[PDB]
């Protein structure tokens, strides 16, 4: 029989609009979200132009309100120049994103003093999330401690990183983290199939011991989040391949397969794709919204899923069990067995809902 799930939330997607709309756009990316059982997305700021100032945020808001099919919030991006400038618009964003390592990003902050300046100037009650790999996780945690506030670590991929976060949580430090499906379901073993172009992602694919360590430390993982990072196959297979994988349409099917194999419970899944995203990012509930899944249907991931403009997937050939049958978003059928039924522009900026503002002391 079907199982009804609440509206799932992905706090880490790249929708590529503005400036990279051949890779994705709000319409195609949120179509891919609905097809993956996702009714609310938080979109990263590494677009063209990047969302690193009030005018770029206003532009992206309209673009999102016109093209998004599911609901959304938009990240602001930290830059080497905008610390202390974001106070009037900070509350309207999903949170502040820091790029602390090299990746598909023009926003790297090279001095730790720039990190501190952001942690000090960004309103302390609003989320800060970091792309922070290996020792950079410990470095950014230190900055959070010096500035006495929380931090959220994006796509944790390594035994090294999850064990460090585990030690920090055991000392009572306010740190949360997310893990992406490719770091749970792929590894070095797959680089031969993928090749060095397709296989290019940051954080890179881990060893089998990295993958095993994340599964063993499920209790340390607060959120699953796709880091949906679409690029075209041409780009992935070209001279300088940009890192990243598309993932909205495969994330939930992969995770449902793990559930059916007894590797985690349905509750563990709902904690990490609904409750914890809500509470870490202060995201509002979605009225009359739910996802119906079929845990019985077995299928094989094809060479590309229907909706993402990436038109490729590193999970090709994996056998999954579990499929999104229907999604209702705020009282409308949004998706059924491969058909997206709400138009571009149906989706709304949740930070403009009364319940979607982050509460704060006057
Ligand atoms: O972390 C990321 N890697 C690659 C990307 F294209 C992107 O948007 N984000
Ligand atoms: Zn990243
Ligand atoms: Zn990302």
Numbering used by the authors: 1460 to 1821
Question: What did the article's authors report about this structure?
Answer:
For the huDHOase–5-FU complex, the crystals were grown in 0.1 M MES, 1.6 M potassium sodium tartrate tetrahydrate, and 200 μM of 5-FU at pH 6.5. In order to investigate the binding mode, we solved the complexed crystal structure with 5-FU at a 1.97 Å resolution. The two metal ions and the R1475, N1505, T1562, R1661, D1686, H1690, and G1703 residues were involved in 5-FU binding. Similar to the malate binding, 5-FU can bind to huDHOase via the loop-in mode. When compared with apo-huDHOase, the dynamic loop in the huDHOase–5-FU complex was shifted by a distance of 10.2 Å and an angle of 40.4o for 5-FU binding. Even though 5-FU is a nonsubstrate ligand for huDHOase, the flexible loop still did not move away from the active site. Additionally, R1661 and G1703 in huDHOase also interacted with 5-FU through water-molecule-mediated hydrogen bonding. As determined through the titration curve, the Kd value of huDHOase bound to 5-FU was 91.2 ± 1.7 μM. The Kd values of T1562A and R1475A bound to 5-FU were reduced to 146.5 ± 2.1 and 161.5 ± 1.6 μM, respectively. Mutational and structural analyses indicated that the 5-FU binding mode of huDHOase differed from ScDHOase and PaDHPase.
